[PDB]
Design a protein around this ligand. Structure first.
Ligand code: HEM
Ligand SMILES: O=C1N[C@@H](Cc2ccc(O)c(Cl)c2)C(=O)N[C@H]1Cc1ccc(O)cc1
Length: 393
């Protein structure tokens, strides 16, 4: 037989039995990626945390020419170091402040938008597609608001994402076409005097501030494209797969309906059990480093399997059960850990909380309209998502 291949499954509704077997028997072990490269797959909470907390396992270096690759780049190599470039330009604090959910009116915008989307679905009648006609539109509207760009530009930017977030063995010509076009769009936004709010409004002001005169226009536009893209794909995909986990747990669905103050704790458990990331997080070793029983060598690829950590019974007893009273509820790795911890974690939480709150109020009897095995799971993609999520209520 051939070396074990990753990823194991594109399904986002069940974790394969192989994960628990590897975690117990070989929590770091060699696998083969879709490009044909070898890598170390890390699947226990202890070893996943070790890797993510040691910067000698470098995100930036995964873009080096000739490196063993998880998948092909869909962005220019410099963009793998996006957060480092933002930090070096002195923009970290400004970006972080712009993507907080605490901006005035933003939560009321989210609620209003969620309720309008649901009203339209009710009006049209069942079955409804909760991904294409609820979760993803809600994500897109939120990120247009956060960025300060017109709501009507959301759909065209969104249509790049089914290619931009592909997990491909080879370079993708369409990724470059859409990237160059979306960069041109964000560059136009920086020169548009109508754009004065949100992240792009703030970047547009800083761009003309003498303290930032040598920050490149390329970086400013890239921040817009990457934060829209990562934010929308991440929140839309998480919300979609969380709704599946909720629908499949009618007791929890009813509890959260009856006691909405528990929704934050429920979203924390839905994050923990979420399978939205289709591959382990990649890092390239910049030194020889012992991880468990393996000496990883400089230049090797390591993959941090988030569901390995998050379903590890040694850290989360009864890991497959959603339990709202865990003593360590936020210690999951759904947002990563260490240098590259998700900068939009608070906003992703509020997106899901408000979306679920609205759905349970408007459609308390929501249920799948097809057998769960009929969901079609997107393949060769950086997220696990069903192509359609048909529900009735
Ligand atoms: C529930 C939703 C979200 C999930 C589950 C999520 C998950 C993650 C994870 C696991 C990482 C770490 C990747 C790594 O270490 O290799 C990450 C990074 C990132 N997230 Fe999120 N995220 C979410 C929402 C958002 C939002 C709303 C934004 C922006 C508005 C965003 C922007 C990013 C960016 C830019 C990075 C890269 C950070 C870096 O390179 O250092 N995410 N996200
Ligand atoms: O900001 C980044 N940091 C790093 C790390 C990263 C990679 C993939 C992700 O999914 C996440 Cl979430 C993080 C990067 O390589 N690229 C962007 C995100 C991004 C990728 C493609 C695209 O078309 C738009 C944005």
């Amino acid at each position: 037989t051939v070396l074990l291949e990753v990823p194991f499954s594109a399904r986002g509704d069940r974790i394969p039995d192989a994960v628990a077997e590897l975690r117990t028997r070989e929590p770091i072990r060699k696998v083969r990626t879709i490009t044909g490269a070898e890598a170390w797959l890390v699947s226990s909470y202890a070893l996943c945390t070790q890797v993510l907390e040691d910067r000698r396992f470098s995100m930036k270096e995964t873009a080096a020419a000739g490196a063993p690759r998880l998948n092909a780049l869909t962005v220019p190599p410099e963009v793998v170091n996006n957060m480092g470039n933002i930090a070096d330009a002195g923009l970290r604090k400004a970006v972080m402040k712009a993507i907080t959910p605490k901006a005035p009116g933003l939560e009321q915008f989210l609620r209003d938008t969620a309720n309008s989307l649901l009203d339209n679905l009710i009006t049209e009648g069942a079955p409804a597609d909760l991904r294409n006609d609820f979760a993803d539109p809600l994500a897109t509207a939120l990120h247009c608001k956060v960025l300060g760009i017109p709501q009507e530009d959301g759909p065209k930017l969104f249509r790049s994402l089914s290619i931009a977030f592909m997990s491909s063995a080879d370079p993708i010509p369409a990724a470059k076409i859409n990237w160059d076009r979306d960069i041109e769009y964000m560059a136009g936004i920086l020169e548009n005097p109508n754009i004065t709010t949100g992240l792009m409004g703030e970047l547009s002001r800083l761009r003309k501030d003498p303290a930032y005169s040598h920050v490149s226009d390329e970086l400013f536009a890239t921040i817009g494209v990457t934060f829209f893209g990562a934010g929308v794909i991440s929140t839309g995909s998480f919300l979609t797969t969380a709704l599946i986990s909720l629908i499949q747990r009618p007791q929890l669905r009813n509890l959260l309906h009856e006691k909405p103050e528990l929704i934050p704790a429920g979203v924390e458990e839905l994050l923990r059990i979420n399978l939205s990331f289709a591959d382990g997080l990649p890092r390239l070793a910049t030194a020889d480093i012992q991880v468990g029983d393996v000496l990883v060598r400089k230049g090797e690829l390591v993959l941090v399997l988030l569901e390995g950590a998050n379903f590890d019974p040694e850290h989360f007893p009864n890991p497959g059960s959603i339990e709202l009273d865990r003593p360590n509820p936020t210690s999951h790795l759904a947002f990563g850990r260490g240098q590259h911890f998700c900068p939009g974690s608070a906003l992703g939480r509020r997106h899901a909380q408000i979306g679920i709150e609205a759905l349970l109020k408007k459609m308390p009897g929501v249920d799948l309209a097809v057998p769960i095995d009929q969901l079609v799971w997107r393949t060769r993609f950086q997220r696990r998502i069903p192509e359609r999520l048909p529900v009735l209520w």
